[PDB]
Amino acid sequence: EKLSAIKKPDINVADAWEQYWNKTLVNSTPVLWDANVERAVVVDLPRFELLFNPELPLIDFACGNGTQTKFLSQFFPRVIGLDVSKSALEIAAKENTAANISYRLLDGLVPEQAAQIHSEIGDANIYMRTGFHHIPVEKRELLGQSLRILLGKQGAMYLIELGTGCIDFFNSLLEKYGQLPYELLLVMEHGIRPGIFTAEDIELYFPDFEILSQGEGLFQSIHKLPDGNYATPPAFWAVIKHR
Ligand SMILES: Nc1ncnc2c1ncn2[C@@H]1O[C@H](CSCC[C@H](N)C(=O)O)[C@@H](O)[C@H]1O
Numbered sequence: 001e002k003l004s005a006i007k008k009p010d011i012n013v014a015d016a017w018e019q020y021w022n023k024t025l026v027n028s029t030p031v032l033w034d035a036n037v038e039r040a041v042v043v044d045l046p047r048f049e050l051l052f053n054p055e056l057p058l059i060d061f062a063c064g065n066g067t068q069t070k071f072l073s074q075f076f077p078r079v080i081g082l083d084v085s086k087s088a089l090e091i092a093a094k095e096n097t098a099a100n101i102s103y104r105l106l107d108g109l110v111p112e113q114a115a116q117i118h119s120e121i122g123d124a125n126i127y128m129r130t131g132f133h134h135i136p137v138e139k140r141e142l143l144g145q146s147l148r149i150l151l152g153k154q155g156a157m158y159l160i161e162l163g164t165g166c167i168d169f170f171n172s173l174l175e176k177y178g179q180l181p182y183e184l185l186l187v188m189e190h191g192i193r194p195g196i197f198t199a200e201d202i203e204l205y206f207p208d209f210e211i212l213s214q215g216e217g218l219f220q221s222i223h224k225l226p227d228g229n230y231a232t233p234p235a236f237w238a239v240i241k242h243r
């Protein structure tokens, strides 16, 4: 049935995502957001590469299976891929390893883990591709805390999320074709739902941050529509740094 903007299934976020990734690992099923780098991080990198100090470590926050992480590691001297899911990192460590990548478990909803990481590496820059929009609204402040801790004063963060129009976009597919995309259903099977992240959310969760640059555009999925084009929901992106 139809996706809701407000109402959502109540989940344990860590558990739901590990269930999804373990199912993905075991069964080798498609991953909705796992677009080839040329349509993903290659599009992102020009938006932040001239703004990040490359002497800081780079964190791929919520790195999933590491597809984007591998590319980042070809451009930055030191990359750390963080994810809540051990199965995600098991795929990453097999398919997307490099001498200058470390994959490490971390739960963004437990800010003490971010504190531990920052105590080891200092201020880090952050790349985050769709790490926020699916987080239940009532848990978002915890993730903001984690991010604030990792960035400190000198770090900058580029994030790209599903933006305003996300739910309408998916519901129009449902209306036009009678079901949601297979690859989206694969995630929703676990109680996970896509959501919306906006400029107003940057102010809400990061009032102590400056927006260096922002925009909208499209987010690239691997779901092919009947005309042969890929489904591309609306995106919101920003580069932010502590004021
Ligand atoms: N609480 C949390 N802490 C850290 N990562 C989390 C998290 N909740 C979900 N995630 C991770 O967020 C990712 C969203 S899917 C996007 C993955 C990756 N950035 C890419 O673009 O390919 C998943 O890998 C999921 O396991």
Ligand SMILES: [Cl-]
Pocket: 011, 012, 013, 014, 109, 139
């Ligand atoms: Cl939770």
Ligand SMILES: [Co+2]
Pocket: 208, 242
């Ligand atoms: Co502050």
